[PDB]
């Protein structure tokens, strides 16, 4: 219920579609934070209320990036859609800026469902969600307990609690994890002494010697391709102590309780992160499907129309919503 200043400039990383009606909206979550979002609806609508889809992700990205592209595209496919900025980020409220939590972020998804549900153009009983990158994990986490969500799709997902706790491909040992936690403790004291939290070094800046998937992230987040000034991943960062919650509170515990509702996990064949979906798929219960996109990288499923299976995503929700 906080009043937020939302820009009217079309600053999306993709052009506005003439086949959709767009406007910005706001809504609060259960923890008292007001979020900002872009709502897209099909034009020349018939008499029946429409199915709806809430889209979030990547983790550290804003609605003007990938989630927005997905939302507009699916709106062209006949769905009412919404791309939102997670708590403390983008145009959403919350302070300190750029802090995250698996709990609060999981809540953000259901706060978005709360809003899209009350729209006069939507049928609250026909709601689905799409979780991209880091929010793929949050989407599955949200659907497990939010029984209103009828189906869920994840795209090139990450389980952010797993990556922050074990690093990529479980590269963090207990000793290294303990060392990191000890350091975080020292950081809490420094932040407490100044009263304000410090931020991690700028995100996605190449120094040389970085693995290809990191170069890919830079090419998306730090070039005209997908750069947006408000995104954490676009040259900014989370607070140094953000990892404390993620490293201590895993998500997906109740992933099997999404069933009987369907899950479609989508992932590029060559993605460094493909294993996250393989883990989630194994942990999940039927109905479930792991769809591998031949030869696709991680960032390919961010904005590549010839790599993102929108036909399949639309077909999936058409049946289940």
From Swiss-Prot:
Family as reported in the entry's similarity comment: To E.coli YcjY.
Organism: Pseudomonas aeruginosa (strain ATCC 15692 / DSM 22644 / CIP 104116 / JCM 14847 / LMG 12228 / 1C / PRS 101 / PAO1)
TM helices/strands, residue ranges: none
The name this protein goes by in its record: Uncharacterized protein PA2218
Pfam family, one: RMMBL
Gene Ontology MF term list: hydrolase activity
Lineage of the organism: Bacteria, Pseudomonadati, Pseudomonadota, Gammaproteobacteria, Pseudomonadales
